[PDB]
Tab-separated table of C-alpha atoms and ligand atoms in Angstrom:
chain	number	residue	atom	x	y	z
A	1	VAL	CA	-12.575	16.848	4.303
A	2	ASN	CA	-12.914	13.501	2.014
A	3	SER	CA	-15.571	11.948	0.592
A	4	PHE	CA	-16.191	8.486	2.527
A	5	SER	CA	-19.153	8.792	3.825
A	6	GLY	CA	-20.931	6.504	6.835
A	7	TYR	CA	-17.632	5.455	8.377
A	8	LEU	CA	-17.824	4.438	11.889
A	9	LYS	CA	-14.753	6.371	13.795
A	10	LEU	CA	-12.413	3.843	15.579
A	11	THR	CA	-9.387	6.204	16.442
A	12	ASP	CA	-8.224	9.817	15.104
A	13	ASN	CA	-7.293	7.928	11.848
A	14	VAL	CA	-8.911	4.772	11.544
A	15	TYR	CA	-12.932	4.712	10.216
A	16	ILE	CA	-14.633	1.805	9.747
A	17	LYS	CA	-17.968	0.447	7.618
A	18	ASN	CA	-19.523	-2.744	6.492
A	19	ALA	CA	-19.351	-2.325	2.554
A	20	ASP	CA	-18.394	-4.844	-0.379
A	21	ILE	CA	-15.103	-2.948	-0.846
A	22	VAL	CA	-15.485	-3.314	-4.917
A	23	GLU	CA	-18.577	-1.437	-4.877
A	24	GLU	CA	-17.033	1.128	-2.254
A	25	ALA	CA	-14.253	2.140	-4.709
A	26	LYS	CA	-16.505	2.420	-7.859
A	27	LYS	CA	-18.727	5.154	-5.754
A	28	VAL	CA	-15.688	6.986	-4.197
A	29	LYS	CA	-13.092	6.607	-6.584
A	30	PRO	CA	-10.495	7.108	-3.801
A	31	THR	CA	-6.733	7.956	-4.904
A	32	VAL	CA	-5.760	4.335	-3.351
A	33	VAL	CA	-7.690	1.407	-2.848
A	34	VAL	CA	-5.982	-1.581	-1.516
A	35	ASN	CA	-5.657	-4.977	-2.508
A	36	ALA	CA	-5.344	-8.234	-0.116
A	37	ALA	CA	-2.610	-9.575	-3.002
A	38	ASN	CA	-0.572	-12.653	-3.012
A	39	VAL	CA	3.088	-12.401	-3.915
A	40	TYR	CA	1.932	-13.239	-7.694
A	41	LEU	CA	-0.422	-11.066	-7.846
A	42	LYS	CA	-2.645	-13.718	-8.852
A	43	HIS	CA	-6.146	-12.565	-8.627
A	44	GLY	CA	-8.181	-15.420	-8.185
A	45	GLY	CA	-10.410	-15.071	-5.433
A	46	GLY	CA	-11.269	-12.906	-1.985
A	47	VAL	CA	-10.515	-9.041	-2.765
A	48	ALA	CA	-8.075	-9.732	-5.535
A	49	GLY	CA	-10.483	-11.510	-7.778
A	50	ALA	CA	-13.349	-9.525	-7.002
A	51	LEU	CA	-11.775	-6.206	-7.517
A	52	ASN	CA	-9.835	-7.798	-10.600
A	53	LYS	CA	-13.287	-9.036	-12.027
A	54	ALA	CA	-14.769	-5.602	-11.592
A	55	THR	CA	-11.519	-4.177	-13.857
A	56	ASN	CA	-13.253	-6.401	-16.664
A	57	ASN	CA	-9.419	-8.447	-15.928
A	58	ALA	CA	-7.400	-5.417	-16.531
A	59	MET	CA	-5.907	-5.424	-13.155
A	60	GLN	CA	-4.608	-9.445	-13.779
A	61	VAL	CA	-3.016	-8.323	-17.558
A	62	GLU	CA	-1.042	-5.188	-15.953
A	63	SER	CA	0.100	-7.556	-12.745
A	64	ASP	CA	1.240	-10.336	-14.912
A	65	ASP	CA	3.174	-7.956	-17.222
A	66	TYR	CA	4.576	-6.518	-13.705
A	67	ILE	CA	5.464	-9.799	-12.333
A	68	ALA	CA	7.108	-10.822	-15.922
A	69	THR	CA	9.315	-7.739	-15.428
A	70	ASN	CA	10.121	-7.749	-11.578
A	71	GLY	CA	9.572	-10.969	-10.463
A	72	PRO	CA	7.224	-11.565	-7.013
A	73	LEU	CA	6.760	-9.496	-4.197
A	74	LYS	CA	7.619	-10.378	-0.586
A	75	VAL	CA	5.258	-11.266	2.269
A	76	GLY	CA	5.013	-8.218	4.219
A	77	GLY	CA	5.578	-6.027	0.925
A	78	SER	CA	3.154	-4.139	-1.801
A	79	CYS	CA	3.576	-2.297	-5.056
A	80	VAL	CA	1.665	0.575	-6.526
A	81	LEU	CA	-0.150	-0.152	-9.833
A	82	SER	CA	-3.138	1.170	-11.720
A	83	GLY	CA	-6.379	1.628	-9.844
A	84	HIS	CA	-8.160	1.247	-13.333
A	85	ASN	CA	-11.581	2.058	-13.319
A	86	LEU	CA	-12.196	1.911	-9.501
A	87	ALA	CA	-9.353	4.526	-7.926
A	88	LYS	CA	-6.349	6.438	-9.117
A	89	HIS	CA	-3.932	3.870	-7.571
A	90	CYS	CA	-4.009	0.284	-6.339
A	91	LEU	CA	-1.642	-0.772	-3.518
A	92	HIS	CA	-1.412	-4.310	-3.584
A	93	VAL	CA	-0.456	-5.315	-0.327
A	94	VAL	CA	0.803	-8.713	0.640
A	95	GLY	CA	-0.370	-9.971	4.137
A	96	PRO	CA	0.834	-13.502	5.403
A	97	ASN	CA	-1.860	-16.288	4.731
A	98	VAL	CA	-2.359	-18.678	7.275
A	99	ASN	CA	-3.763	-21.019	5.392
A	100	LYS	CA	-0.402	-21.527	3.445
A	101	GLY	CA	1.459	-21.515	6.739
A	102	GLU	CA	3.023	-17.825	6.283
A	103	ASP	CA	4.095	-16.219	9.779
A	104	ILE	CA	1.795	-13.909	11.181
A	105	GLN	CA	4.151	-11.753	12.613
A	106	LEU	CA	4.399	-10.071	9.160
A	107	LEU	CA	0.930	-9.060	9.124
A	108	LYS	CA	2.835	-5.765	11.037
A	109	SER	CA	4.971	-5.066	8.221
A	110	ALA	CA	2.336	-5.615	5.570
A	111	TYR	CA	-0.059	-2.646	7.372
A	112	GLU	CA	3.485	-0.248	7.099
A	113	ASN	CA	2.915	-0.329	3.423
A	114	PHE	CA	-0.243	2.070	4.295
A	115	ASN	CA	2.131	4.646	5.854
A	116	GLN	CA	3.382	5.473	2.353
A	117	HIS	CA	-0.248	6.954	1.348
A	118	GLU	CA	-2.217	9.835	2.976
A	119	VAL	CA	-5.423	8.284	2.559
A	120	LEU	CA	-6.502	4.721	1.591
A	121	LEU	CA	-9.767	2.529	1.225
A	122	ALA	CA	-8.451	-1.027	2.481
A	123	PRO	CA	-9.763	-4.456	3.985
A	124	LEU	CA	-8.709	-6.466	7.268
A	125	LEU	CA	-5.158	-7.735	5.500
A	126	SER	CA	-4.531	-11.413	6.235
A	127	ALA	CA	-8.264	-11.953	7.389
A	128	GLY	CA	-10.832	-13.482	5.300
A	129	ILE	CA	-9.531	-16.474	3.250
A	130	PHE	CA	-6.056	-15.721	4.436
A	131	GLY	CA	-7.051	-17.200	7.506
A	132	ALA	CA	-5.938	-14.898	10.634
A	133	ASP	CA	-8.629	-13.807	13.245
A	134	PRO	CA	-10.058	-10.142	12.088
A	135	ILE	CA	-10.270	-8.507	15.525
A	136	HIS	CA	-6.157	-9.439	15.371
A	137	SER	CA	-5.861	-7.730	12.183
A	138	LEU	CA	-8.053	-4.538	13.333
A	139	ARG	CA	-5.701	-4.219	16.318
A	140	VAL	CA	-2.220	-4.277	14.151
A	141	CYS	CA	-4.094	-1.699	11.652
A	142	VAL	CA	-4.916	0.650	14.425
A	143	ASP	CA	-1.753	0.128	16.138
A	144	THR	CA	0.446	0.566	13.001
A	145	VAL	CA	-1.299	3.229	10.075
A	146	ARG	CA	-0.742	6.339	10.980
A	147	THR	CA	-2.443	7.565	7.481
A	148	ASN	CA	-6.016	7.694	7.027
A	149	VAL	CA	-7.380	4.439	6.283
A	150	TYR	CA	-11.237	3.647	5.798
A	151	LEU	CA	-11.826	-0.111	6.484
A	152	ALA	CA	-14.238	-2.075	4.431
A	153	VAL	CA	-15.837	-4.986	6.310
A	154	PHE	CA	-17.461	-7.093	3.765
A	155	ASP	CA	-19.601	-9.630	6.572
A	156	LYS	CA	-22.166	-7.739	8.340
A	157	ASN	CA	-22.120	-10.058	11.154
A	158	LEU	CA	-18.259	-9.453	11.568
A	159	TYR	CA	-18.167	-5.959	11.198
A	160	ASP	CA	-20.737	-5.685	14.503
A	161	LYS	CA	-18.173	-8.169	16.210
A	162	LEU	CA	-15.484	-6.054	15.213
A	163	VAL	CA	-17.009	-2.891	16.398
A	164	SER	CA	-18.566	-4.659	19.655
A	165	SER	CA	-15.051	-5.871	20.524
A	166	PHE	CA	-13.112	-3.131	19.779
A	167	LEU	CA	-10.842	-1.458	22.662
B	201	WQO	N1	-16.931	-8.578	-3.600
B	201	WQO	C1	-16.259	-8.676	-2.717
B	201	WQO	C2	-14.885	-8.147	-1.638
B	201	WQO	C3	-14.225	-8.750	-0.645
B	201	WQO	C4	-14.321	-9.801	-0.876
B	201	WQO	C5	-13.479	-10.581	0.215
B	201	WQO	O1	-13.150	-11.971	0.445
B	201	WQO	O2	-12.811	-9.690	1.266
B	201	WQO	C6	-12.415	-10.367	2.477
B	201	WQO	C7	-10.957	-10.978	2.351
B	201	WQO	C8	-10.191	-11.545	1.700
B	201	WQO	C9	-8.989	-11.825	1.630
B	201	WQO	C10	-8.187	-11.420	2.560
B	201	WQO	C11	-8.749	-10.637	3.451
B	201	WQO	C12	-10.010	-10.430	3.531
B	201	WQO	C13	-11.221	-9.529	4.232
B	201	WQO	C14	-12.186	-9.055	3.117
B	201	WQO	C15	-13.371	-8.835	4.131
B	201	WQO	O3	-14.244	-9.980	4.524
B	201	WQO	O4	-13.960	-7.948	4.547
B	201	WQO	C16	-15.073	-10.774	-1.638
B	201	WQO	O5	-14.581	-12.087	-1.580
B	201	WQO	C17	-15.739	-10.186	-2.686
């Protein structure tokens, strides 16, 4: 048993909800919240900017120190950093950004990072302002992640479309 509530059941291990992921993280304080990061960990907008804002910019301060030491991530890669006031850990995962012209095939590699964690609260990688079709991202998630993933979809109208079209 875990503390996630009101999620629809898509598969044995994938659950989904219409929620603001920042507000969800605050309530649950999950072991792992996934950030939809870029390779520079520059948390300007989207999930990244919103989580970062909720940490009072402490996520960005930590991230800049990480990059100064380690250099950028790979598209498809990840790093584990603090979850600050939102979660124990934040898994920063870089999905391909279609609006930057990155290869959507890398989405599966991005979701494979989730398998290193038993339970996660996460967004649909590469969707939203990253430019991919959320229906596709959800399909790749279900077909790649084997650990227990609790997906938050910010937009109610898209959430209903994702549920109604899910095979
Ligand atoms: N408080 C919040 C929470 C989330 C977002 C957001 O953009 O998230 C979308 C986002 C952003 C970037 C990549 C993928 C996704 C999917 C996610 C969604 O639409 O579910 C926001 O701007 C403010």
